[PDB]
Design a protein around this ligand. Structure first.
Ligand SMILES: Nc1ncnc2c1ncn2[C@@H]1O[C@H](COP(=O)(O)OP(=O)(O)O)[C@@H](O)[C@H]1O
Length: 243
């Protein structure tokens, strides 16, 4: 059983626009943790946009959990996928409102569980106003790494079977980075995970790494296998990011 399948996917953003995704074929097993890497503009983000049916491919199919997304209920699909957004925590609103910003009438309990997996609960619980803390600046003063753990909690709150991490657009403080990496196995447990990675090192221990270039998957495998292809793009990108 594959949780996510792309078959022969062709996609451009607008009728005249350039083909961005060119005959993408991908099958991700349930519970697999996938890293997608590649230069900027290679199509990484577009791939995840298709998973959420934000856009519709001119050719080929996307299937989630067996189901062709053409036919799947858009509300169900929405609940099936949690996305860890970058820089998308509403400042004028409380931590709990921010975490439950999908189903506002859900359990404080479910909010807490998700913050705990995300490694946010401990810092939230030591705030004067706790979960009612208004996230925004002067109202509290949450750091960027703290807001990011809130973003993970948000993605996790409805217990999605698929979790997607959008590419990091920023550097997090060492403590936030540390807590997240320490909790990653708990966050991903029981879910099919896609991580769009800035630094290759981020997805070193993924079950499989997908290497995209100019809208195509050019290489795929575990890190060690990808580095064994002598002239691989993966090796080149790996060398470019080495210290
Ligand atoms: N909304 C959009 N409309 C038109 N082109 C877009 C849009 N979003 C992304 N693109 C383009 O599609 C290509 C791949 O984008 P993207 O999927 O974001 O790559 P990546 O995540 O690898 O950096 C780029 O040429 C980018 O400018």
């Amino acid at each position: 059983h594959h949780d996510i399948t792309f078959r022969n996917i062709r996609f451009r953003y607008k009728p005249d626009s350039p083909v961005i995704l060119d005959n993408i074929n991908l099958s991700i097993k349930q519970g697999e943790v996938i890293g997608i890497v590649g230069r900027s503009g290679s199509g990484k983000s577009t791939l995840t946009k298709l998973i959420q049916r934000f856009y519709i491919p001119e050719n080929g199919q996307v299937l989630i959990d067996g189901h062709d997304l053409a036919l799947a209920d858009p509300n169900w699909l929405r609940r099936q996928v949690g996305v860890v957004l970058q820089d998308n925590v509403l400042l004028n609103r409380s931590i709990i409102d921010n975490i439950s910003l999908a189903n506002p009438g859900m359990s404080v309990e479910k909010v807490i569980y998700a913050a705990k997996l995300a490694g946010a609960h401990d810092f939230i619980s030591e705030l004067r106003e706790g979960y009612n803390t208004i996230v925004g600046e002067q109202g509290a003063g949450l750091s960027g790494g703290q807001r990011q753990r809130i973003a993970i909690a948000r993605a996790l709150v409805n217990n999605p079977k698929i979790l997607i991490f959008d590419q990091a657009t920023s550097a997090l403080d060492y403590e936030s980075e540390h807590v997240i990496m320490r909790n990653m196995h708990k966050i991903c447990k029981g879910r099919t995970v896609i991580i769009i990675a800035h630094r290759l090192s981020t997805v070193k221990n993924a079950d499989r790494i997908i290497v995209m270039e100019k809208g195509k998957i050019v290489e795929q495998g575990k890190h060690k296998e990808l580095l064994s292809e002598p002239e691989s793009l993966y090796s080149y990108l790996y060398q470019l990011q080495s210290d």
